[PDB]
């Protein structure tokens, strides 16, 4: 009942149809749990060719986004959002997004996401217009739209109504009972709900330990988790 409004600044607003028209996020939008509203800097140009890029001072190969159309688009989104809208710029130089960061961001009722293109935006716009910079990971992309949609999808899951502990997930199985000689673990067939819970937890702990052992350091395990992990490490050994 705590819907979310997300403003987006992008030279390619139609990309956002990927989240607004399909799947769980598509349903969230249709049901007004989530609203995504886009402004395109191109609509804020005044020259005949609607120029949205500009040359960097100091030379170099790439172009930056042109300040005036971009700035005007941001101001327009801010005016539509009213008070309390945090403005976010998606870039590799930003704070690294993780699930904890998602839950933090999901506390905001209003967000404005600025999507960079070309070699990015003028540093002074970050100083004057941007509240926080975030990265979805340590890699470089051709635009901030995919990171913006990634963020929107992640926070959308925390909006009550949208959906139906620091560890990786357990393996899951569905029909058929045998698949290419591979059988479903009997415990999952046993109907014994407490045995199944402990099995999945143990699998989560083992999988986390094997694939992402650094994740376990961030955790204070319950006595039960400590035990199951020890068991798994014993059996693995």
Ligand X SMILES: NC(=O)c1ccc(N[C@@H]2CC[C@H](c3ccccc3)C2)nc1
Structure tokens at 140: 């470089």
Residue 24 touches ligand X, criterion: CB under 6 A:
no
> Distance between CA 159 and CA 153 in Å, rounded?
10
What minimum distance in Å lies between the beta carbon of 92 and its own copies?
7
By CB under 8 A, tell whether 216 contacts its own copies.
no
130 near its own copies (CB under 8 A): no
Identify whether 208 is preceded by a cis peptide bond (ω within 30 of 0). Answer: no
Which of 169, 224 has the CB closer to its own copies? 169
Is there a contact between 202 and 222 (Cβ–Cβ < 8 Å)? no
Number of residues counted as binding its own copies (CB under 8 A): 83
Sign of CA dihedral 134, 216, 156, 17: positive
- 88 is a site residue for ligand X (CB under 6 A): no
Which of its own copies, ligand X, none has residue 154 at its interface (CB below 5 to 8 Å by kind)? its own copies
| Shortest distance in whole angstroms from residue 147 CB to its own copies | 8
Verify binding: residue 207, its own copies, rule CB under 8 A: yes
Q: Indicate the length of the chain as a whole number.
A: 237
Which residues within the stretch 48-77 sit at the binding site for ligand X (CB under 6 A)? none
**Contacted entry of ligand X, its own copies, none for residue 187, CB cut-off 5 to 8 Å set by kind:** its own copies
User: What does 144 interact with, of its own copies, ligand X, none (CB < 5 to 8 A by kind)?
Assistant: ligand X
Name which of residues 108 to 167 contact ligand X (CB under 6 A). Answer: 116-117, 120, 135-137, 139-141, 143-144, 147
Residue 108 binds to its own copies (criterion: CB under 8 A): no
Within 10 A of 191 (CB to CB), how many other CB atoms are there?
8
According to the annotation, is 89 in a ligand binding site? yes
Task: Return the residues of window 30-59 that contact its own copies according to CB under 8 A.
Answer: 54-59
174 binds its own copies (CB under 8 A): yes
In whole angstroms, what is the distance from residue 129 CA to residue 140 CA? 23
Residue positions forming the annotated binding site for S-adenosyl-L-methionine: 89, 116, 136-141
Q: Which residues bind ligand X (CB under 6 A)?
A: 90-93, 116-117, 120, 135-137, 139-141, 143-144, 147, 169
């Amino acid at each position: 009942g705590s819907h979310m409004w997300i403003g987006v600044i992008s030279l390619f607003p139609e990309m956002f149809k990927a989240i607004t028209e399909f799947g769980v996020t598509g349903r969230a939008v249709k049901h007004n749990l989530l609203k995504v509203e886009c402004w395109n800097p191109r609509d804020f140009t005044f020259d005949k060719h609607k120029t949205v890029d500009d040359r960097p001072y100091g030379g170099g190969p790439g172009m930056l986004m042109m300040v005036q159309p971009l700035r005007d688009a941001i101001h327009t989104a801010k005016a539509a959002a009213g008070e309390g809208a945090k403005v976010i710029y998606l870039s590799p130089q930003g704070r690294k997004l993780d699930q904890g960061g998602v839950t933090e961001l999901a506390q905001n009722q209003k967000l404005i996401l600025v999507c960079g293109r070309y070699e990015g935006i003028d540093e002074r716009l970050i100083q004057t217009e941007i509240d926080e910079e975030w990265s979805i990971g340590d890699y470089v992309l051709t635009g901030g739209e995919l990171p913006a949609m990634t963020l929107i999808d992640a926070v959308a899951r925390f909006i009550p109504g949208v959906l139906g502990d620091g560890l990786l997930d357990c393996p899951h199985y569905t029909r058929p009972e045998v698949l290419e000689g591979l059988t479903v673990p009997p415990v999952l067939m046993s109907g014994h709900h407490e045995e199944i819970r402990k099995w999945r937890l143990k699998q989560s702990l083992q999988r986390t330990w094997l694939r992402r052992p650094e994740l376990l350091e961030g955790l204070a395990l319950t006595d039960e988790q400590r035990k199951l992990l020890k068991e798994a490490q014993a059996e693995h050994n």
